[PDB]
């Protein structure tokens, strides 16, 4: 690694030292001659090394074998991949193969038909610390989609959505799932806790990247069975609901049902729902009349002192004061009481 210009006659019998130490008997100093021969091949007959590096090994040389392949692969294409394909006919011995079709994939997109079968084996491996390797294999399926570019690709996204439904890294996988959908799902949302809200979060993400109006009528039945994390999911749901309202009578019923949910809150999630409702809809003053009575009891509890809820209620009172401009006398009196408070 440091002195390739030392000599060349000593380079002739490196193999007389290194390949002699292949025939040892342990499992660590046998492997350590596979790595020191991978630095020498990667400078300037090389078939027998990398056909045995990916062979059936125990879980002892996990970090040991992987460093011997990553330093070998950029000279391998210089000197084809049937031997990686031949070991797929014979699990735990796949992850050594998977990590070399993970990093240097500039040439890997040649026969990707086995990569689709490996993507089918990726979901079989998804069913643990290898889940991070499976998410890396899930990112490899997005990478192979970025390397190759069928109907199995939509089926692979269905297993990836089920992998997200089985659950950080999944948020990055859901962002990768959003990019893959842009490049049965409503029935999967109807079939499915917090991951089902995340499945509802990905359903609105797939809806973004008319027909959305009739789907909102089905989603109104979905939102009726649903209405913190539920408030965060409804915040993404109201952004999908108001996007179709930005461009009929079904939208008035969904606004009235959420106003009934705002009446059911009168707890803080309805104020969070009303802030999202007033974010892109002009007329909400009818629900704001009982909400001002609820915010007056909320300001009385806030003045007696849930700091995030009181700040949101103050933001709700900030939104209600812009909308009110006939309880302006009682609202200004509580505002002066809040101004006189600590």
Partner 1 sequence: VVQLDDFATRLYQSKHSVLSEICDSLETYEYFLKSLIPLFIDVLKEVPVSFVANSPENKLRNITLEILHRIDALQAYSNEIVDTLMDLLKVENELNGILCMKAITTLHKTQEKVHPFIDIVIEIYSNIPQVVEEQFSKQLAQAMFSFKTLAESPITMVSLYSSYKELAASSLGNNRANYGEFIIGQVKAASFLAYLFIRRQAQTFLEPYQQAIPDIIIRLLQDCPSELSAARKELLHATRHILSTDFRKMFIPKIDLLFDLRVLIGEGFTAYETLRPLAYSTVADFIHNVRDHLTPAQLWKSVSIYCKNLQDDSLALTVQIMSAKLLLNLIEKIMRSESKTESRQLLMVIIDAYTKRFKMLNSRYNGIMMSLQEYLPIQVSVPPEIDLLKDSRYLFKTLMTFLKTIMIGLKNSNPPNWNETARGFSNEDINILKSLFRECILALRFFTKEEKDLMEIFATMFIHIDPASFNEIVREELPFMYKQMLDFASLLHIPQFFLASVITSSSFSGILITFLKSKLVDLGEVNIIKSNILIR
Where do contacts with partner 1 occur on this chain (CB under 8 A)? 1, 25-29, 32, 35-36, 39, 58, 60, 62-64, 67, 89, 117, 120
What span, in angstroms and rounded, lies between the C-alpha atoms of 199 and 189?
6
What span, in angstroms and rounded, lies between the C-alpha atoms of 276 and 4?
66
Please report how close the Cβ of residue 236 comes to partner 1 at its closest, in angstroms.
35
Judged by beta carbon, residue 117 or residue 333, the one nearer partner 1 is 117
Please report how close the Cβ of residue 214 comes to partner 1 at its closest, in angstroms.
37
Q: Which two tokens stand for residue 121?
A: 């084996």
Instruction: Decide: residue 42, CB within 10 A, 0-12 exposed, 13-18 middle, 19+ buried.
Output: middle
Judged by beta carbon, residue 37 or residue 276, the one nearer partner 1 is 37
Please report how close the Cβ of residue 25 comes to partner 1 at its closest, in angstroms.
5
Judged by beta carbon, residue 95 or residue 199, the one nearer partner 1 is 95
Distance set, CA 33 to CA 2, 9, 15, 312, 340 (Å): 18, 20, 10, 64, 78
Q: Which two tokens stand for residue 78?
A: 């210089």
Instruction: Quote the distance between the C-alpha of residue 6 and its chain's center.
Output: 50
Please report how close the Cβ of residue 32 comes to partner 1 at its closest, in angstroms.
5
Distance set, CA 124 to CA 54, 66, 85, 120, 139 (Å): 21, 22, 18, 7, 15
Judged by beta carbon, residue 63 or residue 211, the one nearer partner 1 is 63
Judged by beta carbon, residue 9 or residue 90, the one nearer partner 1 is 90
Number of neighbours of residue 232 by Cβ within 10 angstroms? 14
Judged by beta carbon, residue 29 or residue 92, the one nearer partner 1 is 29
Please report how close the Cβ of residue 89 comes to partner 1 at its closest, in angstroms.
6
Half-sphere exposure for 173 (CA within 13 Å, toward CB)? 27
Largest CA distance in the chain: 98
Please report how close the Cβ of residue 136 comes to partner 1 at its closest, in angstroms.
16
């Amino acid at each position: 690694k440091g002195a390739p210009t030392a000599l060349t006659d000593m380079r002739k019998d490196i193999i007389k030292f290194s390949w002699n130490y292949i025939k040892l008997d342990d499992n660590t100093s046998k492997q350590a001659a596979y790595v020191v021969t991978a630095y020498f091949i990667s400078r300037f007959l090389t078939t027998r090394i990398f056909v045995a590096l990916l062979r059936c090994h125990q879980i002892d040389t996990r970090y040991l074998v992987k460093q011997a392949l990553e330093l070998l692969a950029p000279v391998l294409s210089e000197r084809w991949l049937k031997w990686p394909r031949r070991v797929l006919s014979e699990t735990q011995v796949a992850n050594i193969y998977q990590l070399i079709v993970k990093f240097p994939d500039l040439f890997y997109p040649a026969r990707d038909h086995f990569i689709p079968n490996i993507i089918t084996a990726m979901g079989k491996l998804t069913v643990l610390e290898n889940q991070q390797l499976a998410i890396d294999l899930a990112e490899l399926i997005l990478k192979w989609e970025t390397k190759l570019p069928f109907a199995q690709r939509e089926a692979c996204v269905t297993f990836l959505i089920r992998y997200i439904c089985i659950s950080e890294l999944g948020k990055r996988a859901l962002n990768i799932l959003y990019e893959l959908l842009g490049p049965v799902k409503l029935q999967f949302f109807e079939r499915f806790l917090l991951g089902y809200c995340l499945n509802a979060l990905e359903v609105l993400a797939v809806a973004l990247k008319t027909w959305i109006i009739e789907n909102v009528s089905y989603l109104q039945k979905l939102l009726e069975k649903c209405l913190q994390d539920i408030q965060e999911i409804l915040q993404k749901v109201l952004g999908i609901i108001l996007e179709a309202i930005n461009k009929e009578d079904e939208p008035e019923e969904v606004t009235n049902f959420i106003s009934l949910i705002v009446n059911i809150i009168g707890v803080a999630a309805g104020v969070s729902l009303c802030w999202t409702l007033s974010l892109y809809r002009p007329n909400a003053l009818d629900s704001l009349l009982p909400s001002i009575m609820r915010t007056f009891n909320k300001l009385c509890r806030d003045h007696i002192a849930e700091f995030e809820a009181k700040v949101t209620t103050n933001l709700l009172e900030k939104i209600l004061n812009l909308c009110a401009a006939d309880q302006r006398r009682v609202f200004l009196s509580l505002l002066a009481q809040l101004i006189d408070r600590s």
